[PDB]
Amino acid sequence: HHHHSSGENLYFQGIWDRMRDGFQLQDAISTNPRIERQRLWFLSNQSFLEQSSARGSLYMHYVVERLEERNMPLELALLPVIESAYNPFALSRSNAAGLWQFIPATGQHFNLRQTNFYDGRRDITASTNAALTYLERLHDMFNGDWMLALAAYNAGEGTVSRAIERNEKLGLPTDYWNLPLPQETQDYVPKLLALSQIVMAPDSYGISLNPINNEPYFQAVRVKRGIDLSSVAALANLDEDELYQLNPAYKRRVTMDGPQQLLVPMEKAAFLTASLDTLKPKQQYRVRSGDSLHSIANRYRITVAELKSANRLSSNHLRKGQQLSIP
Ligand SMILES: CC(=O)N[C@H]1[C@H](O[C@H]2C[C@@H](C(=O)NCCS(=O)(=O)O)[NH2+][C@@H]2CO)O[C@H](CO)[C@@H](OS(=O)(=O)O)[C@@H]1O
Ligand SMILES: [Zn+2]
Ligand SMILES: [Zn+2]
Ligand SMILES: [Zn+2]
Ligand SMILES: [Zn+2]
Ligand SMILES: [Zn+2]
Ligand SMILES: [Zn+2]
Numbered sequence: 126h127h128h129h130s131s132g133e134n135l136y137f138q139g140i141w142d143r144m145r146d147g148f149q150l151q152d153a154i155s156t157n158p159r160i161e162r163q164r165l166w167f168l169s170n171q172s173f174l175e176q177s178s179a180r181g182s183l184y185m186h187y188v189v190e191r192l193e194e195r196n197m198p199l200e201l202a203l204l205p206v207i208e209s210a211y212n213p214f215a216l217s218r219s220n221a222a223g224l225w226q227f228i229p230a231t232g233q234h235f236n237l238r239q240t241n242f243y244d245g246r247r248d249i250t251a252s253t254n255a256a257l258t259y260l261e262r263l264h265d266m267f268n269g270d271w272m273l274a275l276a277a278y279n280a281g282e283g284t285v286s287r288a289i290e291r292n293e294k295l296g297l298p299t300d301y302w303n304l305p306l307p308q309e310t311q312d313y314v315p316k317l318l319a320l321s322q323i324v325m326a327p328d329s330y331g332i333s334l335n336p337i338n339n340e341p342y343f344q345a346v347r348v349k350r351g352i353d354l355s356s357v358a359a360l361a362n363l364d365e366d367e368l369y370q371l372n373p374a375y376k377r378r379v380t381m382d383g384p385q386q387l388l389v390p391m392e393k394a395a396f397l398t399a400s401l402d403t404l405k406p407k408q409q410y411r412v413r414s415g416d417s418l419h420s421i422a423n424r425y426r427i428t429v430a431e432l433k434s435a436n437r438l439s440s441n442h443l444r445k446g447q448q449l450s451i452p
């Protein structure tokens with residue numbers, strides 16, 4: 126069972142090469158019609174993996190490193206593909222949320238808080254660490270069997286246990302493949318295995334995996350409560366959309382009820398690590414470049430005369446970063 130060394134890392138071409146290095150489930154796969162069936166779906170519908178991978182490039186490095194640190198099967202790095210298409214905003218009919226598709230009750234078990242301001246199930250780092258802990262615990266409950274653990278992740282430990290017991294009573298084997306599970310769960314395991322077979326040897330299937338570098342996409346940066354993502358976007362010259370995709374838990378795009386931390390693009394990490402205390406949870410107006418008394422007055426539906434009356438100006442000519450009281 127390979128334990129990964131970080132000294133291997135500089136030699137990987139991209140994320141897919143790195144991911145395969147940590148696969149643990151490939152040897153014990155075998156012919157089962159159910160796997161081939163899923164594989165054919167992927168081969169016939171290639172845009173699914175392609176679009177999942179594009180969205181995946183924000184998150185996949187993070188997931189791979191967490192799985193490597195715990196020596197867990199790197200095939201689980203593909204679980205968000207089949208769960209959510211690596212879309213943290215995905216919401217199932219069961220109200221499964223985030224990359225890992227936690228239902229409300231299971232989210233609550235793992236203390237992934239759900240408030241008007243914050244949904245921990247969408248939180249990339251919190252939901253990833255909870256999902257890996259849940260999968261490890263399920264693996265431990267089923268005597269180290271990853272197939273049953275995956276089945277239980279989808280259907281619940283209870284459903285899988287009762288199915289095992291029922292087979293025992295009937296005198297049938299109790300491995301995953303022999304349990305008569307709901308169709309979603311019957312498909313779940315072979316789907317992940319099929320996808321992992323393609324990722325393991327994509328050339329042999331005529332698949333081209335989306336190029337994704339073997340580099341971090343984001344860094345965690347300390348932030349105060351009550352900051353708007355728009356304010357951070359402006360400070361760092363970023364698209365608010367990118368920050369939201371990295372911090373999907375913050376339903377109202379303000380840092381409340383969460384980790385007091387923002388994931389930010391690597392290229393802005395140094396700047397924001399240095400800068401993020403200048404923003405303050407938020408009458409007063411900060412004069413921009415290109416502002417005049419007139420333009421400011423127009424924006425606030427007041428008159429220039431009222432605006433001058435409310436301040437103690439040496440001249441009409443404003444300076445960038447100057448503070449004005451708005452009447
Ligand atoms: C990660 C997670 O929350 N797993 C939970 C799982 O969700 C599944 C549900 C599924 C889902 O959303 N199905 C419907 C999809 S669709 O909207 O109908 O297409 N996706 C999730 C992860 O695989 O539902 C089962 C059963 O309730 C839960 O087991 S139990 O609570 O112990 O019984 C289990 O905890
Ligand atoms: Zn070991
Ligand atoms: Zn390795
Ligand atoms: Zn699901
Ligand atoms: Zn094991
Ligand atoms: Zn960028
Ligand atoms: Zn007025």
Ligand SMILES: [Zn+2]
Pocket residue numbers: 442
């Ligand atoms: Zn001047």
